[PDB]
Design a protein around this ligand. Structure first.
Ligand SMILES: O=C(NCc1c(C(=O)O)[nH]c2ccccc12)c1ccc2[nH]cnc2c1
Length: 167
């Protein structure tokens, strides 16, 4: 038993809700919140900009130190950093950005990072400003992640299309 509320159960291990991941993160304090990161951990917009703002820019400060030490992530890769006031940990995961021409097949590799964590609150990778089809992203998520994933979908209209079209 865990503290996530109001989710619709899609599969054995995947759950979905219409929620603001920032507000869901502040209420659950999950062990892991997933950020929709880029390779530079520059948290300017989308989910990353929203999570970072909610940390009063502490996520960005920590991220800049991480990059200065380690260099950029790989597309499809991840790193674990602090969750600040939102979670114990933040798993920064880089899905491919279609608006940069990145190979969509890397979306499966990105979701594989979730399997290193028993339970996660997460957005749909490569959705939103990353330019992928969220329905495709949901299918890859379901077919790749084996751990328990609670997907927060900000847009109510999108949440309805994802549910109604889910196979
Ligand atoms: O961009 C936001 N959500 C869209 C999105 C999804 C999704 O919802 O499936 N997946 C993504 C992956 C990368 C980038 C963006 C997305 C977002 C979320 C909460 C906010 N709170 C204030 N602004 C906000 C913006």
């Amino acid at each position: 038993v865990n503290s996530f509320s109001g989710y619709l159960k899609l599969t054995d291990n995947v759950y979905i809700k219409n929620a603001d991941i920032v507000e869901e993160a502040k209420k659950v304090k999950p062990t892991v919140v997933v950020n929709a990161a880029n390779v530079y951990l520059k948290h300017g917009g989308g989910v990353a900009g929203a999570l970072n703002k909610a940390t009063n820019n502490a996520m960005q400060v920590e991220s800049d130190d991480y990059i200065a030490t380690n260099g950029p992530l790989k597309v499809g890769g991840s790193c674990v950093l602090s969750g600040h006031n939102l979670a114990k940990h933040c798993l920064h995961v880089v899905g491919p950005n279609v608006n940069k021409g990145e190979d969509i097949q890397l979306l499966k590799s990105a979701y594989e990072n979730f399997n290193q964590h028993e339970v996660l609150l997460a957005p749909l990778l490569s959705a939103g400003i990353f330019g992928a089809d969220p329905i495709h992203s949901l299918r890859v998520c379901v077919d790749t992640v084996r751990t328990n994933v609670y997907l927060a979908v900000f847009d109510k209209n999108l949440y309805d299309k994802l549910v109604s079209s889910f196979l």
